[model samples]
Target: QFTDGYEVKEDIGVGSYSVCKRCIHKATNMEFAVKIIDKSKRDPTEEIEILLRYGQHPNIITLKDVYDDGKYVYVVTELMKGGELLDKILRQKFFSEREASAVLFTITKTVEYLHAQGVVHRDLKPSNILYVDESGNPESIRICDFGFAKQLRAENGLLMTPCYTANFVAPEVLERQGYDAACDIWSLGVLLYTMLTGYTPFANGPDDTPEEILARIGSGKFSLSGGYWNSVSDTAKDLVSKMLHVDPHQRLTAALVLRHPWIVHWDQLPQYQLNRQDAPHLVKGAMAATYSALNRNQ
Candidate 1:
């Protein structure tokens, strides 16, 4: 609940320019999340408008109301009690391919919805996705944080901004070349790789610098060897390979990813049908190495 009729609850998230507080409606006794953004530090008009446009979409977090004072902007949204996808990954024992398929299906469907409306989610990393309700189920997730999203016009459908999370960014974004909605597919591919193996495909070692890492990502080459990946199915890797391609024109689209056999026939995957029992440590180890290297260089 807040100072008004609502109650101020625990702080669930924090960003560079915004703080996400879980709040309750004092009158109706309903729950909601409010992102209070400091207007002096950043402008949130685009994010608000994007939410308003897509509020009815099931895979997106619904923005219920908006209010702003001179200093801050209050953007009230649906309460997602399940937290972030990265946190859920860190806590889970082992993630299965079947489970990955289910989550990916939901994400692709949502991306399809966005692309159909000429909207591009410029940033599609794991941290930006949230699960709904108390269940931490990956399949029950919603895409949030549209600060980097761009609305394309009928004449020009390409995006030319470099604003993105380094690890999950597409090759075109790094090259300063104009990219289209297919860029999201590229990011989704990297995210899928990370989700399946608990390791970023291109984050080789802790000593690698950001330049070196970005170069690797731009090159779109990564090994699926050693440790946990040996148990993964070839079909899964095949889909990742197509999505991580350096050429956006050749990359898999959201519709294509949804139609891929790995997702369409998930339960019948031939290899590594069992859950990854050591995913928690493996994912943490990889993230630690990647972030340690990133922090050192930056």
Candidate 2:
């Protein structure tokens, strides 16, 4: 039925369990991304349900159609041509604190909306954040891959699954304590840190073991003493420190993040470009290893 309705094209992405292909709707001649999942490996029903429920949001990826025929599951969604946020940062010629604030604000707003609906995006890494097109517009970012998302029931407000990516995972998740939507805020902190410094706060190197990375994240010890951080304002650092707090209760909620001085006074933040010769290289190496880990876990 999927092939009958849409013409399949070249493969755009290959994950551990699925392959994403570009396709065109036969009648409308519109393009969409179709992720084909091997039925024997995993079931995508939960992800499909979550998408169908929240895909209407502006920053969340939109689901177009789905098909199953016992062997594979075909998931159709909007095609994002802008690639991953990781690539955007690597390619950026001029990055500033104000620009980073804009990006974080958009993502925080989206997460706030999801929280209001009782859903938690357990995975919010750079690879999962994509732009709708190649326009480089900060607002065009769309959060994708709901494979790890869960809708919390009123009976239990906390999530205990302990599912997460090592570098972006919250300390409470690693500690095996029941975590909540605030875990997403911790990931945002990692994102903000990477956006500002061109490296992750917890990962020492690409070869760092999961235990090593988790240890750093759990301790919540990081510094802004490098030359790259010299030009950054204390206000920006303050927000990062608050968001990366080990205690989920102490972490800034999505609403609180939006209200933070850095985000609220975005225009007042430094507009000068943070140009570092080694930033692109650092981003490339960091993302290369992150992608490897992602594929292994996916």
Candidate 3:
């Protein structure tokens, strides 16, 4: 049934439960990314519904069509050609605070919209953050992969399951405490920290065990004293600190983050390029560690 109206091409991506392929609609000849989920591995109803509900937002990956069969469920969405956020960062010659702020502003605005809908994007890692095309514009960013997303109702506002990538997981998530949307802010903090310094706050190296990473996150202690922090502005650090606060309740909300000076007046922020000498190795290691964690979880 999937091939009835669309021609599925080679694999573009692979996850534990699905294979994403580049597809062309026979009628319109439009390109799309089709994520085919094996039913034996997992049920994708929740993910399908979430995408259908929130896909209209420009920053969210848009769903195009759906096909169901006895063996698999095909979810067709807008193809993102710009690649992952980490890949974009890696290719940059001069990654500045202003550019980082632009990236964060889009993500935060999208998160604010999701929160308003009572939905929580439980997975907010760099891999899920994608760009719509080869354009380097930050506005092309799109949030994808709704497998771990859940809607919070009055009766079930707190999420308990420990579904997260290790490096970006919040302290409360590791502690097994009931958490809410604020957990996303913690992940955003880790993202912002990495954007500014080329490495995550809690991860020491590529070989850090999950236990080691979790322990560091739980302790909530990260150094901003060395050369990496020297060029980053204090206001940026202040926002990161608020977002990374150990207590979920104390962390800044998506709305508050948007209002922060670093985000509100991003153009006025320092445009100093972070030290590029050590960035490649540090970023590559961090990405490797993150991908390893993703594979383990899958």
Candidate 4:
């Protein structure tokens, strides 16, 4: 409301969750991102709690400060000027297998950290991850969007996101019973499929209800194209199998994903080629996303 002592820069992104704005500290000459939300929103208090718990995570975007000034409360943190992960990958075509694996490794490593802290990212999708550096390297991925995440204290909750979760929901979530961190693995499978195929693996005829969707996923008969996947090593396939497994008990855990063959020898690839050009097969998700010098990668 009042820009009295603080300076609000430009509007960044808007969502039902919060409106992010670039801000600067007049006295210190420091820049920050401010997520402005009305104090009256649902889960306003709990939302802050979720982010505060997440503030402990380095790879997860930091929630710098939050305070109410009668009109709206401001949640400020460091700004990642580079852009988002989906934008970068889509802009490039679909990143190469090596590039995709690099993103996967970053994702798994971040998830492993969250699991260690008893945090289950109820919503994991391409849109939620931010690429801090404009170079679009796998290492630049900084996980954001903790709106639906929880501390794992409840018996169970219906975590949503049809494309990401309807087909990948952990059995425990499907049964409406206790579930653990395996849900993240299921999401990773969906992401892996997209990364490799440049498309989603699941589809519906239309008018598919949640039950129908869940059932389709339960049937579990699926195949990968040799053309799209011939170069993908078996170790990657094995990892996807366990991650996408219907049985939560059998699904791969964050700890296991770290050691999975696809990830175990992952250091062979570069993090991000600073000056590499886009490949023909690269599926750049975002339109007209050119590299800027201000991009963190530079």
- Identify the runs in model 1 with alpha carbons over 4 angstroms from their true place: 1-3, 136-139, 154-180, 204-208, 270-298
Worst 10 residues of 3 by lDDT: 153-162
Point out the higher-scoring one by TM-score: 1 or 3.
3
- State which candidate has the highest TM-score: 3
The candidate with the higher lDDT, 1 or 3, is: 3
Clashes of 2: 0
TM-score, candidate 4, is 0.72
Model 1 poorest 10 in a row by lDDT:
153-162
Model 2: per-residue Cα lDDT over 65-164, one tens digit each: 9999889999999999888886686567678889899999999999988876757888877878999898878667899999878764332344323332
Reference-based TM-score, model 1: 0.80
Tens-place lDDT per residue, model 4, 170-193, is: 555434322446666777886776
Model 4 residue 211 CA deviation in Å: 8.0
lDDT of 3 at 276: 36
Taking all chains together, each candidate's TM-score versus the true structure is: 0.80, 0.85, 0.86, 0.72
State model 2's lDDT.
0.79
Better of 3 and 4 by lDDT: 3
Residue 94 displacement (Å), model 2: 1.4
The global Cα lDDT (0 to 1) of model 1 is: 0.73
**Candidates arranged by TM-score, highest first:** 3, 2, 1, 4
lDDT scores in order = 0.73, 0.79, 0.80, 0.63
The Cα RMSD in angstroms, rounded to one decimal, for candidate 1 relative to the true structure is 6.2
